[PDB]
Each structure stands twice: as C-alpha cells, then as structure tokens.
Amino acid sequence: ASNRKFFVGGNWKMNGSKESNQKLLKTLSDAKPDANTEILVAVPFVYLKDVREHLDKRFHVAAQNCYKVASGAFTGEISPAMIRDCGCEWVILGHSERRHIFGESDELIGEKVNHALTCGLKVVPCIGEKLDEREAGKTEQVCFRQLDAIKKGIPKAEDWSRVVIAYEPVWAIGTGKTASPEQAQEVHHAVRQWLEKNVSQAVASSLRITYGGSVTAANCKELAKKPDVDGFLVGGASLKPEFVDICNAN
Amino acid sequence: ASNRKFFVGGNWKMNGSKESNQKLLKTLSDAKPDANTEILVAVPFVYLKDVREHLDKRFHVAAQNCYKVASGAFTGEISPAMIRDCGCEWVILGHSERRHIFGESDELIGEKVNHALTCGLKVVPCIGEKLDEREAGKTEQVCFRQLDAIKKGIPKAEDWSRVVIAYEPVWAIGTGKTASPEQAQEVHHAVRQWLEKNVSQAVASSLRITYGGSVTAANCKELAKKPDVDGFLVGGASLKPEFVDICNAN
Numbered sequence: 264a265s266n267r268k269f270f271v272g273g274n275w276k277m278n279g280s281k282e283s284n285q286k287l288l289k290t291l292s293d294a295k296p297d298a299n300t301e302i303l304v305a306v307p308f309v310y311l312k313d314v315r316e317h318l319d320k321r322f323h324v325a326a327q328n329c330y331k332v333a334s335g336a337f338t339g340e341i342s343p344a345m346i347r348d349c350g351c352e353w354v355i356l357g358h359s360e361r362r363h364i365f366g367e368s369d370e371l372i373g374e375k376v377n378h379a380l381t382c383g384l385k386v387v388p389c390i391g392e393k394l395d396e397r398e399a400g401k402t403e404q405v406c407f408r409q410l411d412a413i414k415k416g417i418p419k420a421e422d423w424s425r426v427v428i429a430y431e432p433v434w435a436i437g438t439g440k441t442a443s444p445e446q447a448q449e450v451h452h453a454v455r456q457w458l459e460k461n462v463s464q465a466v467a468s469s470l471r472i473t474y475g476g477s478v479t480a481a482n483c484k485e486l487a488k489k490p491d492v493d494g495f496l497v498g499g500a501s502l503k504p505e506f507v508d509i510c511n512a513n
Numbered sequence: 514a515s516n517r518k519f520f521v522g523g524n525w526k527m528n529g530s531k532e533s534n535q536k537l538l539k540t541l542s543d544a545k546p547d548a549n550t551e552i553l554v555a556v557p558f559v560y561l562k563d564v565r566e567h568l569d570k571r572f573h574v575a576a577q578n579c580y581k582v583a584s585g586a587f588t589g590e591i592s593p594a595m596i597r598d599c600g601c602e603w604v605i606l607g608h609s610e611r612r613h614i615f616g617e618s619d620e621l622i623g624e625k626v627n628h629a630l631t632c633g634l635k636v637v638p639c640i641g642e643k644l645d646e647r648e649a650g651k652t653e654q655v656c657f658r659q660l661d662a663i664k665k666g667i668p669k670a671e672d673w674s675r676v677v678i679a680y681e682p683v684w685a686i687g688t689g690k691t692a693s694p695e696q697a698q699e700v701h702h703a704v705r706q707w708l709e710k711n712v713s714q715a716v717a718s719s720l721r722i723t724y725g726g727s728v729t730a731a732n733c734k735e736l737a738k739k740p741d742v743d744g745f746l747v748g749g750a751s752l753k754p755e756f757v758d759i760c761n762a763n
Contacts, residue, residue, distance in 0.1 A: 308558035328589030338608035339578030
C-alpha cells in the first residue's frame, strides 16, 4: 500500500446555468461525507465564486483554466489571483481541449503551472495521446514530452505535493471508449516510473495519477482497483447524479 | 449630421478584484456621465454576474470573449448562453490580445460573431494592425481581411444594429502611442467606405466605429471631434477615475 489518498475530479467543462448548478450542487451536498476521497468540481469562471459559496469546504472548487500572471493586458484571461479572490484554490491546466482545439503549447502550460504554484494554488495538469497518435504507437512519446514540460514548470521540489496529474487519452474523451483497466494501468505505471527516473522516487511514490476518459458509474470500480490509478477526472458524468457513485469507486 | 449615438466602452482586461471592483463602480455609479453616451464595461468572467448585479441598467456589462457553441466539452470556455444567464448582453470579440497572443483566427472570430448574434447578444468586434503591418503599408489589407471575416459571420443584414466596431491599432495598445486624430479619422473613414460598398449604405451610416489604444482624459476630445470616430474602447484608463471624463469626450 502507498500513502496516496483517492482523488475524484468532476470537470463540468462548458455546461451550467444558475438553475442547473443549484440542483447539481444540492445532490453533491446531499451525499454523506467521505473522509477517504478528495472531491473536486471544476466549474465555469462565471459560476466559480457562486459554486464555492454553495458547497461546504469539504469539496475543492477549481477553475477550468487560468493565465500566467496576476494582472495585465490579457483580454478574456483569468489569473490565480482572481481565482483565490473567488474563494478557490484549484485550477485544471493543459486539458486536452486547451492543448488541441485552443492550441496551448506544452511550454505555456509549464508557465501556467509555475505561476499557479507560486501563487499558492493546487494544480491538475492533464496529459495524454490522441487517437491518431495511439494508432501510430506514439502513446509513450506523447506522455513523456508532456510530463517533461510539466516538471520544467514546477517552482520547487516540495510543490509536487500540490499537483495531481490526470492521464486522459483523447480518444476516450466524449467517445464512450473508456480505456480498459489494463490500458490505463499500463500508462499510469509508465508515468509513475517516469517520475521515479526524471523526478524522484519520493515524488513518484506520493503523486496521485488519475485517469480521465469516459468514466462512468459502470466502469469506475474496476479502474480504481488498479494499483497505479489514484482517482479520476470525470467529464460528462460529473453533471449527473451518478457522479456520487463514481466518488465512491474505491 | 449622422444618426449615430456616442459609444464608450471600458475594457478592464485581466484586472479586477472584488475590492477594487467596488471602488471603480462607485466612481462610475456616483458620477453621472452624459445620458447621450452608451457606456459599456467589459469585465473578467469571474466577476461578470456581480458587476451586472451592482451597476445601473444605464450601463452595459460585457464579457471579454466567448465561444461559438451554446454548451459543450470546451474546458475553459464561456458561451453566450452563460453570459445571458449572468444577466449580461454584450461581448467583446476578436480583441488584439485574443488574435495575436491566444491564436484566434479571423474564421473563428467570424463564427463567434455568428453564434453571439444568433443568441441575441450585442457584440464589439475588434480590428486593427500591429506596428509592423503599419510600417509595411498594409493597414488597409489587414483591416479589410478582418472586416470580411466579420461580415461572413453576420447571420443577416438586420443584425448589424447589434454590432459596434472597435478599431484598435496594436501599436497604440498600452504604450502611450495614441493614433493622431487624423490617423484615426482616416482609418475609420476607409472602414466606413468598405462597409458602404460591401454591406449597405443603411449599415455604413448607422454603425459606430470606435477607437481604442492609449485613450485617456487628455486626448479623447480631439479624437472624438473627428466625424467617423464614434467613441472609444478604453483599456488602462478604464481602471482609473478619468474613465468618467472619457465618457464625457463628445
């Protein structure tokens, strides 16, 4: 056994309204507390303050992105300073959609990580390969490059305690084609040893590597059983009552 | 001799905090700038609902950006549906920072305009040239390409009544390098002639084409005197109390 506490994230992505959210959050507060699972929701900026004040401090409330300075001439960007000013402590960075769709460079994710961590936030950097990269056998090549650019952004060694990595194969996002427990175990295993070789045994030992990619109430329990899977980043199912089931996957 | 109402918008960019927001809005709330001016304020997403909630219906409140679909798997994006949900009806689109730092194409700005107008919002699409395209003599070619891709996203001619153009030369943004009154008038005039030929005479004569880029209380009146400059998009000076004086420039 390791010292890794199970971590469940719910990424709402671009979904939500006053009326939709208030019902969702009630469901969430309705479930009994579980001191054994770290639970995060990542909500749209326009709701970020409002969600935070409608959920007990037990649950982490995250922004879905941020930028890399506190203030400045960046029309339409949000800083860690503004996230904290909204009562919040978490941010998701380098989600596949920001990298592939909005084109954000491995380098830019690096700088955002650096800045977020220097401002005392906790981060969830995402990695993973596209379908075309998996058909071409570049899964390992992709994850390694992405992870190298993440460590390059880490202010100090100790700040790894405020990082949770999520591996999300892009072919598994939205597609209903969840990685098998063996497929995910294979990548998570390779991530943890890469952290051993490229970072530090102590960092590899304590880091929660979470799986993302069509996580449902029907598949979460088999994935959570695997020894290198420390949790999930849930997309679609984060908006439904079953999210509660998925929080109870371990 | 025109029918066009004076328009002054304040783009706060990536600046704001609940504390400094209350201070700004008080200066603006307590004062009484000309009822002959449309006053717009474009705020960070995290504080959008609160600013609309605490600012008179005298004022417009805008998002600084949005995406081109109503809901979806676009981590980090805010839709027109969520902006309306927050009580707000305006969006800045194609700001220079959004085109040149964050990689938004002309085709993307066009499609965002399409989706925002379809959803009922009013839009402030932004066009202008960098210090190098001006030094290359391509101001016109650049602004025209920008204009054509905005026209392509107008779902029908009637929608231009919910459009205000902002011309902001990138070489004037946050530098103190204000366009001269004659440099603004010349570009605005040519933009209006482009409109006149490619859309309507009805659309050209009614459209506010506004200037931004180092607008301050000290230079606004000479720019506002020019007949095809119909107001402003103010950045830096929108955070200062002199924003009220720029609201009174006509």
